[PDB]
Amino acid sequence: GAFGDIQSRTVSSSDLYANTNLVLQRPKAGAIHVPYTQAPSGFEQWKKD
Amino acid sequence: CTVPLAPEPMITFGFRSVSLKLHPKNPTYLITRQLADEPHYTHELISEPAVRN
Amino acid sequence: TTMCLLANVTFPCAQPPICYDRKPAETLAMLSVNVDNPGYDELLEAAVKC
Amino acid sequence: STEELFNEYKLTRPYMARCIRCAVGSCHSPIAIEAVKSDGHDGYVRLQTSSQYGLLKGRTMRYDMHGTIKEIPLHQVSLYTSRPCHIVDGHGYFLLARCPAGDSITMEFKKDSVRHSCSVPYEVKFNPVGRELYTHPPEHGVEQACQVYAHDAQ
Amino acid sequence: GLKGRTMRYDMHGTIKEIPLHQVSLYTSRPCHIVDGHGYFLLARCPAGDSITMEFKKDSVRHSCSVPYEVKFNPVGRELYTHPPEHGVEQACQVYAHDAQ
Residue D8 with chain C: CB contacts under 8 Å:
44, 48
Which residues, other chains included, contact C48 with Cβ-Cβ below 8 Å and sequence gap of 6+? C19, C20, C21, C27, D7, D8, D10, D11
Sign of CA dihedral C16, C19, C22, C25: positive
CA distance D21 to D33: 11
> Can chain A be said to touch chain B, i.e. do they have 3 or more Cβ pairs within 8 angstroms?
yes
Chain D contact for B17, CB < 8 A?
no
Q: What angle do CA C15, C16, C18 make, to 5 degrees?
A: 135
Judged by DSSP in three states, A24 sits in strand
Task: List residues of chain B with CB under 8 Å from any CB of chain A.
Answer: 2, 5-8, 10, 21, 23, 25, 49
**Burial class, A45, CB count within 10 angstroms (exposed 0-12 / middle 13-18 / buried 19+):** middle
Cβ B25 vs Cβ A38: under 8 Å: no
List the subunits that have 3+ CB pairs under 8 angstroms with D.
A, B, C, E
Mutate to test the interface with D, among E42, E72, E85 (most CBs of D within 10 A): E85
Residue B45 with chain D: CB contacts under 8 Å:
133
Beta bridge partners of A17: A7
Half-sphere exposure in the Cβ direction for C39 (13 Å, CA): 15
Which residues precede chain breaks (C–N over 2.5 Å) in chain A? none
Q: How many CB pairs under 8 A join A and D?
A: 9
Q: Find, in chain D, the residue whose alpha carbon is nearest to that of B30.
A: D131
d(CA B9, nearest CA chain D) in Å: 15
CA distance E28 to E67: 12
Beta bridge partners of D152: none
Q: Find, in chain D, the residue whose alpha carbon is nearest to that of A32.
A: D140
Residue D139 with chain A: CB contacts under 8 Å:
33, 35
CA distance E57 to D153: 43
Please judge whether D11 and C44 are an interchain contact, meaning their C-beta atoms are less than 8 angstroms apart: no
Q: Write the DSSP string, chain D.
A: -HHHHHGGGGG-----EEESB-SSSSEEETT-EEEEE--SSSS--EEEEEEEE----SSEEEEEETTEEEEEEGGGEEEESSSB----EEEEEEEE-----BS-EEEEEE-SS-EEEEEE---B-----SSB--SS--SS--B-------SS--
Domains of chain D: 3-154 (2.60.40.3200)
For the beta carbon of residue D30, count every other beta carbon within 10 angstroms.
Answer: 25
Please judge whether B6 and A28 are an interchain contact, meaning their C-beta atoms are less than 8 angstroms apart: no
Method used to determine the 3D structure = cryo-EM
Task: Compute the residue count for chain C.
Answer: 50
Chain A contact for D132, CB < 8 A?
no
User: What 8-state DSSP symbol labels residue E70?
Assistant: B
Reported structure resolution in angstroms: 3.5
List the subunits that have 3+ CB pairs under 8 angstroms with A.
B, D
Chain D contact for E85, CB < 8 A?
yes
d(CA A24, nearest CA chain D) in Å: 11
The H or E element spanning position B30 is strand B28-32
Chain A contact for D73, CB < 8 A?
no
List the subunits that have 3+ CB pairs under 8 angstroms with E.
D
Judged by DSSP in three states, B9 sits in coil
Residue D129 with chain B: CB contacts under 8 Å:
1, 3
Nearest to D154 by CA among D2, D44, D20: D2
Residue D140 with chain A: CB contacts under 8 Å:
25, 27-28, 33, 35
Closest partner residue to E81 (CB to CB) among D80, D103, D113 is D103
Please judge whether D141 and B28 are an interchain contact, meaning their C-beta atoms are less than 8 angstroms apart: no
Residue E81 with chain D: CB contacts under 8 Å:
103-104, 121
